[PDB]
Scaffold this motif. Structure first.
Motif, PDB file in Angstrom:
ATOM      1  N   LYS A   1      71.290 -39.954  -8.881  1.00 19.01           N
ATOM      2  CA  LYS A   1      72.056 -40.338 -10.061  1.00 19.01           C
ATOM      3  C   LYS A   1      73.138 -41.347  -9.692  1.00 19.01           C
ATOM      4  O   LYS A   1      73.294 -42.379 -10.356  1.00 19.01           O
ATOM      5  N   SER A   2      73.923 -41.045  -8.644  1.00 23.52           N
ATOM      6  CA  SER A   2      74.949 -41.973  -8.179  1.00 23.52           C
ATOM      7  C   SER A   2      74.364 -43.338  -7.845  1.00 23.52           C
ATOM      8  O   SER A   2      74.961 -44.375  -8.163  1.00 23.52           O
ATOM      9  N   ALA A   3      73.190 -43.360  -7.212  1.00 23.72           N
ATOM     10  CA  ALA A   3      72.576 -44.636  -6.851  1.00 23.72           C
ATOM     11  C   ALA A   3      72.321 -45.501  -8.090  1.00 23.72           C
ATOM     12  O   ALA A   3      72.679 -46.682  -8.122  1.00 23.72           O
TER      13      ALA A   3
ATOM     14  N   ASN B   1      82.065 -53.992   7.227  1.00 24.12           N
ATOM     15  CA  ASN B   1      82.221 -52.811   6.399  1.00 24.12           C
ATOM     16  C   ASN B   1      81.747 -51.559   7.110  1.00 24.12           C
ATOM     17  O   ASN B   1      82.120 -50.454   6.710  1.00 24.12           O
ATOM     18  N   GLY B   2      80.949 -51.715   8.165  1.00 25.79           N
ATOM     19  CA  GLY B   2      80.222 -50.596   8.701  1.00 25.79           C
ATOM     20  C   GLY B   2      79.109 -50.211   7.745  1.00 25.79           C
ATOM     21  O   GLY B   2      78.831 -50.923   6.773  1.00 25.79           O
ATOM     22  N   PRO B   3      78.438 -49.091   8.015  1.00 24.48           N
ATOM     23  CA  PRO B   3      77.306 -48.675   7.167  1.00 24.48           C
ATOM     24  C   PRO B   3      77.765 -48.336   5.758  1.00 24.48           C
ATOM     25  O   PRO B   3      78.920 -47.961   5.526  1.00 24.48           O
ATOM     26  N   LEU B   4      76.852 -48.519   4.814  1.00 20.76           N
ATOM     27  CA  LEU B   4      77.038 -48.072   3.456  1.00 20.76           C
ATOM     28  C   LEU B   4      76.954 -46.550   3.427  1.00 20.76           C
ATOM     29  O   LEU B   4      76.532 -45.902   4.400  1.00 20.76           O
ATOM     30  N   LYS B   5      77.337 -45.968   2.288  1.00 23.15           N
ATOM     31  CA  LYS B   5      77.187 -44.532   2.070  1.00 23.15           C
ATOM     32  C   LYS B   5      75.972 -44.318   1.179  1.00 23.15           C
ATOM     33  O   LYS B   5      75.654 -45.162   0.334  1.00 23.15           O
TER      34      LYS B   5
ATOM     35  N   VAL C   1      71.122 -51.147  -2.928  1.00 22.83           N
ATOM     36  CA  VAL C   1      71.474 -49.801  -3.362  1.00 22.83           C
ATOM     37  C   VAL C   1      70.817 -48.813  -2.411  1.00 22.83           C
ATOM     38  O   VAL C   1      69.627 -48.935  -2.131  1.00 22.83           O
ATOM     39  N   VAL C   2      71.580 -47.839  -1.924  1.00 28.78           N
ATOM     40  CA  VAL C   2      71.047 -46.812  -1.023  1.00 28.78           C
ATOM     41  C   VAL C   2      70.809 -45.524  -1.808  1.00 28.78           C
ATOM     42  O   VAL C   2      71.763 -44.829  -2.185  1.00 28.78           O
ATOM     43  N   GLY C   3      69.537 -45.184  -2.051  1.00 30.98           N
ATOM     44  CA  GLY C   3      69.197 -43.896  -2.609  1.00 30.98           C
ATOM     45  C   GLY C   3      69.057 -42.874  -1.503  1.00 30.98           C
ATOM     46  O   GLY C   3      68.978 -43.221  -0.313  1.00 30.98           O
ATOM     47  N   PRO C   4      69.041 -41.597  -1.867  1.00 32.96           N
ATOM     48  CA  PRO C   4      68.918 -40.543  -0.847  1.00 32.96           C
ATOM     49  C   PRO C   4      67.520 -40.533  -0.254  1.00 32.96           C
ATOM     50  O   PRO C   4      66.524 -40.810  -0.929  1.00 32.96           O
ATOM     51  N   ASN C   5      67.457 -40.215   1.038  1.00 32.09           N
ATOM     52  CA  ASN C   5      66.197 -39.989   1.731  1.00 32.09           C
ATOM     53  C   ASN C   5      66.003 -38.479   1.845  1.00 32.09           C
ATOM     54  O   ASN C   5      66.630 -37.822   2.686  1.00 32.09           O
ATOM     55  N   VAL C   6      65.153 -37.916   0.986  1.00 33.13           N
ATOM     56  CA  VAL C   6      65.013 -36.458   0.987  1.00 33.13           C
ATOM     57  C   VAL C   6      64.213 -35.953   2.183  1.00 33.13           C
ATOM     58  O   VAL C   6      64.287 -34.764   2.508  1.00 33.13           O
TER      59      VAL C   6
END
Length: 168
Positions: A108-110, A70-74, A93-98
């Protein structure tokens, strides 16, 4: 199966306990455990490292295979792989890294991926090395998730702060 005990109700569908998510998964036998993953599914530290170690690296071997396809997740995205000995499925699940400047909106998307599963054992997303405020992350969780979420928080100091900020 899904024998959750000792959880405190926060809303109709969000529960919390001061506990180790790995120990909980072994006792509870949940249908789904959530992993706080990065885009490369490299389970080196934090929650991800602990869950992987509890599978004795089975989860990393499977993850490497998925990334080769798949390559990397988004950021904001997810994938459902095996739960091995911890659960029937693991939702990565990938959450954002601020810290890296990734958009806090994507949290929210996560959490939205949680809505494809009827009951989940989960950590707070984007806490720790991902840099987001954990109380803020719990706010987004309770706003976004419509299915049953059981949250395991290890740090007693943070647990008390969360329960205060939501029920006080």
């Amino acid at each position: 199966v899904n024998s959750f005990s000792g959880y405190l109700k926060l809303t109709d569908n969000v529960y919390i306990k001061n506990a180790d998510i790995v120990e909980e998964a072994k006792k509870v036998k949940p249908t789904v455990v959530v992993n706080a993953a990065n885009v490369y599914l490299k389970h080196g530290g934090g929650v991800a490292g602990a869950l992987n170690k509890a599978t004795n690296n089975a989860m990393q071997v499977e993850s490497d295979d998925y990334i080769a396809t798949n390559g990397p997740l988004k950021v904001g995205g997810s994938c459902v792989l095996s739960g091995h000995n911890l659960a029937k499925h693991c939702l990565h699940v990938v959450g954002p890294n601020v810290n890296k400047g990734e958009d806090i909106q994507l949290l929210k998307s996560a959490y939205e991926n949680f809505n494809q599963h009827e009951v989940l054992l989960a950590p707070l997303l984007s806490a720790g090395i991902f840099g987001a405020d954990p109380i803020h992350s719990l706010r987004v969780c309770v706003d976004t998730v419509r299915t049953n979420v059981y949250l395991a928080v290890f740090d007693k100091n943070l647990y008390d702060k969360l329960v205060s900020s939501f029920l006080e």
